[PDB]
Amino acid sequence: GIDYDKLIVRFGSSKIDKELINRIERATGQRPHHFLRRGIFFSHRDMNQVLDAYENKKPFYLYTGRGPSSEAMHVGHLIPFIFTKWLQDVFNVPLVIQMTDDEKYLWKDLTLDQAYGDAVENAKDIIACGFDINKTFIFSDLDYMGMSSGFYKNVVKIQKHVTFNQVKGIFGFTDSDCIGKISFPAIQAAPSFSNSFPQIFRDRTDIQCLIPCAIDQDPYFRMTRDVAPRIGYPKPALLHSTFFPALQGPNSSIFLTDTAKQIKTKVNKHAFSGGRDTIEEHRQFGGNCDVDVSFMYLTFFLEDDDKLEQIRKDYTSGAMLTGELKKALIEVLQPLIAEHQARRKEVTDEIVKEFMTPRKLS
């Protein structure tokens, strides 16, 4: 029992209600994604503003990012992108994806070239998620900073309105930290304003931003929202989601690089079970879907609501065993991961380059 209602108030966000979900549905003319109608993406901030702009034929855009990783990207990392891809499709709005290679360089043991390299590679995985090349700008901080007539200006503006004491509290920086880490929050914030991308929005500063993110990141995004009116820009809207369960609750998680046999082995051997120790005692008391990692993953990926609920009931009653549940998950992940690998393999250096080239979108 995690409890997210104690978080909506802890941060001051606005819990998304069955009422808000309906306006989205009416505005998009499509059934709400399962993350919504399942509470994956529960809370938000200013979502109604976005709809106001949209319904009244006024465009808005999406912003999300990732810290280029030299390591593997697991299924958990897909949640944000899947939702953003959906938002992008149903609203048909531009999307900018920031690869914070400068950030990784500042925090990890990498040369500037290696950081950039990890960014271009992670870019393939992101493109693999299926984003439309005609309305998605994926950019490396290291590359785009030197080719934007608006980005650095916004960074300087933000840097002037944020003090060390403020970032010390929000991010825990110390006196021993390099000056690059200390001013980085401005780089991460700048993408929230439309005129940071002249090639896409030009001089416009009204096209509001929408940022899908994790609930426990709301404090960080508060900095950006607080600086917005201070420098004359609309605050970016937010859509919060729950956390992704850890495997145990190496084999730390299921990476998008694992094979069918690897997935199978990870689940059946490491997926934390909320079921009983013996098959006799399990049918006796049932399983706990609340803490059963295997079922939790199903809530994220299994798209059939009925098929999902049926599993919850059976596992809870004790009818379905753990190994059987694990088989239900493995049969959903293998094709998930499999398809990702296929799409990624078809992403050429040409395609990557086009996604990462500042240009007019549609």
Ligand X SMILES: Nc1ncnc2c1ncn2[C@@H]1O[C@H](COP(=O)(O)OC(=O)[C@@H](N)Cc2c[nH]c3ccccc23)[C@@H](O)[C@H]1O
Q: Work out whether 220 is an interface residue with its own copies (CB under 8 A).
A: no
Minimum CB distance to ligand X, residue 39 (Å): 14
Tally of residues, the chain: 362
Q: Which does 157 bind (CB under 5 to 8 A by kind): its own copies, ligand X, none?
A: its own copies
Q: Work out whether 112 is an interface residue with its own copies (CB under 8 A).
A: yes
Q: Work out whether 177 is an interface residue with its own copies (CB under 8 A).
A: yes
Instruction: Quote the CA–CA distance of 297 and 315 in Å, as a whole number.
Output: 14
Q: Which of 288, 248, 275, 244 is nearest to 1 (CA)?
A: 288
Q: Work out whether 160 is an interface residue with its own copies (CB under 8 A).
A: yes
- Yes or no: say if 177 and 338 are a contact pair by the CB < 8 Å rule: no
Q: Work out whether 96 is an interface residue with its own copies (CB under 8 A).
A: no
Question: Closer CB to ligand X, residue 89 or residue 216?
Answer: 216
Strands of 233-305, DSSP E: 237-241
Question: Closer CB to its own copies, residue 59 or residue 67?
Answer: 67
The H or E element that residue 213 is part of is: strand 209-214
Q: Work out whether 56 is an interface residue with its own copies (CB under 8 A).
A: no
Q: How many CA atoms, within 13 angstroms, populate the side-chain half-sphere of residue 248?
A: 3
Q: Work out whether 153 is an interface residue with its own copies (CB under 8 A).
A: yes
Q: Which of 279, 263, 260, 285 is nearest to 323 (CA)?
A: 279
Q: Which does 175 bind (CB under 5 to 8 A by kind): ligand X, its own copies, none?
A: its own copies
Q: Work out whether 171 is an interface residue with its own copies (CB under 8 A).
A: no
Q: Which does 142 bind (CB under 5 to 8 A by kind): ligand X, its own copies, none?
A: its own copies
Instruction: Quote the CA–CA distance of 346 and 235 in Å, as a whole number.
Output: 37
Minimum CB distance to ligand X, residue 204 (Å): 20
Binding test (CB under 8 A) with its own copies, winner from 183, 262, 265, 288: 183
DSSP code at position 41: S
Which residue stretch of 15-23, 154-162, 246-254, 345-353 sits at the interface with its own copies (rule: CB under 8 A)?
154-162
Number of other CB atoms surrounding residue 333 within 10 Å? 21
Q: Work out whether 219 is an interface residue with its own copies (CB under 8 A).
A: no
Q: What separation in angstroms does the CA of 255 have from each of 267, 283, 341?
A: 12, 32, 11
Amino acid at site 314: D
Which residue stretch of 122-130, 155-163, 205-213, 298-306 sits at the interface with its own copies (rule: CB under 8 A)?
155-163
Coil, helix or strand for 25? helix
Give residues in contact with its own copies (CB under 8 A): 102, 105-106, 112, 142, 145-153, 156-157, 159-165, 167-168, 173-180, 182-183, 185-186
